Amino acid sequence: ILKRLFKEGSDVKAGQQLYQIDPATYEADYQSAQANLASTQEQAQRYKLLVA
Amino acid sequence: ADGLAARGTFTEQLQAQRDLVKASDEYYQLADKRYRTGVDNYLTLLDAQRSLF
């Protein structure tokens, strides 16, 4: 845990950020999947142009 | 008689040859569209251009 972003004894709201568990491997495999999207979306758009 | 045979067969041969040229021209145009969109490289475009030539 890197941070605690809520004041104790406060009216918390649905969708508020409480902690921050350290994103390192999650940012890593997020970029590893974002690279696949950045290639295969180009593939989909090129073939969508060429089907016409 | 050989001249008449040439008149009789070269219309069929030349129409088949113009259809050959139309098919190869449309193949080159599709390879050019495939290159301009970006899927294949320029070497395959030059190969289609040599086939049309």
UniProtKB/Swiss-Prot annotation, chain A:
Organism superkingdom: Bacteria
What induces or represses expression of this protein, per its UniProt record? By growth under severe iron limitation.
**Where does it reside?**
Cell inner membrane
Instruction: Give the knockout phenotype.
Output: Disruption of MexA, MexB and OprM significantly reduces active efflux of N-(3-oxododecanoyl) homoserine lactone/3-oxo-C12-HSL/PAI-1, but not N-butyryl homoserine lactone/C4-HSL/PAI-2.
Oligomeric state and interaction partners are given as: Component of the MexAB-OprM multidrug efflux complex, composed of six MexA subunits forming a hexameric tube, binding to a MexB trimer, which interact with the trimeric OprM outer membrane channel protein. OprM is thought to not directly contact MexB; instead, MexA joins MexB and OprM by forming a funnel-like hexamer anchored to the inner membrane. MexA may initially form a hexameric ring complex with MexB prior to OprM, then OprM undergoes a conformational change as it contacts MexA, allowing the periplasmic gate to open.
What family, per the record?
A: Belongs to the membrane fusion protein (MFP) (TC 8.A.1) family.
What biological function has been recorded for the protein in this entry? Answer: The periplasmic linker component of the MexAB-OprM efflux system that confers multidrug resistance. Functions as the major efflux pump for n-hexane and p-xylene efflux. Has been shown in one study to be involved in the active efflux of the autoinducer N-(3-oxododecanoyl) homoserine lactone, thereby playing an indirect role in quorum-sensing; but has been shown in another study not to be involved in efflux of this autoinducer. Over-expression of the pump increases antibiotic and solvent efflux capacities. Implicated in the secretion of the siderophore pyoverdine.
- Something else known: In both X-ray crystal structures approximately the last 100 residues are not ordered.
What's the protein here called? Multidrug resistance protein MexA
High-level lineage: Bacteria, Pseudomonadati, Pseudomonadota, Gammaproteobacteria, Pseudomonadales
Q: Which gene encodes it?
A: mexA
Complete-protein stretch covered: 74 to 125 of 383
From Swiss-Prot, chain B:
Role description: The outer membrane component of the MexAB-OprM efflux system that confers multidrug resistance. Functions as the major efflux pump for n-hexane and p-xylene efflux. Has been shown in one study to be involved in the active efflux of the autoinducer N-(3-oxododecanoyl) homoserine lactone, thereby playing an indirect role in quorum-sensing; but has been shown in another study not to be involved in efflux of this autoinducer. Over-expression of the pump increases antibiotic and solvent efflux capacities.
Q: What is this protein called?
A: Outer membrane protein OprM
* Quaternary structure note: Component of the MexAB-OprM multidrug efflux complex, composed of six MexA subunits forming a hexameric tube, binding to a MexB trimer, which interact with the trimeric OprM outer membrane channel protein. The OprM homotrimer forms a 135 Angstroms-long pore. It consists of a beta-barrel, which is probably inserted in the outer membrane, and an alpha-barrel formed by alpha-helices which probably spans the periplasm. In the ground state the periplasmic end is closed, while the outer membrane end opening is 6-8 Angstroms in diameter.
The protein's induction, as recorded, is:
By growth under severe iron limitation.
What is reported when this gene is inactivated? Disruption of MexA, MexB and OprM significantly reduces active efflux of N-(3-oxododecanoyl) homoserine lactone/3-oxo-C12-HSL/PAI-1, but not N-butyryl homoserine lactone/C4-HSL/PAI-2.
Q: What's the source species for this entry?
A: Pseudomonas aeruginosa (strain ATCC 15692 / DSM 22644 / CIP 104116 / JCM 14847 / LMG 12228 / 1C / PRS 101 / PAO1)
Q: Which family does it belong to?
A: Belongs to the outer membrane factor (OMF) (TC 1.B.17) family.
What gene is it encoded by? Answer: oprM
Q: Which residues of the full protein are shown?
A: 387 to 439 of 485
Localization of this protein: Cell outer membrane
Organism domain of life: Bacteria
Q: Which effect does the record note for changing R34A?
A: Abolishes complex formation
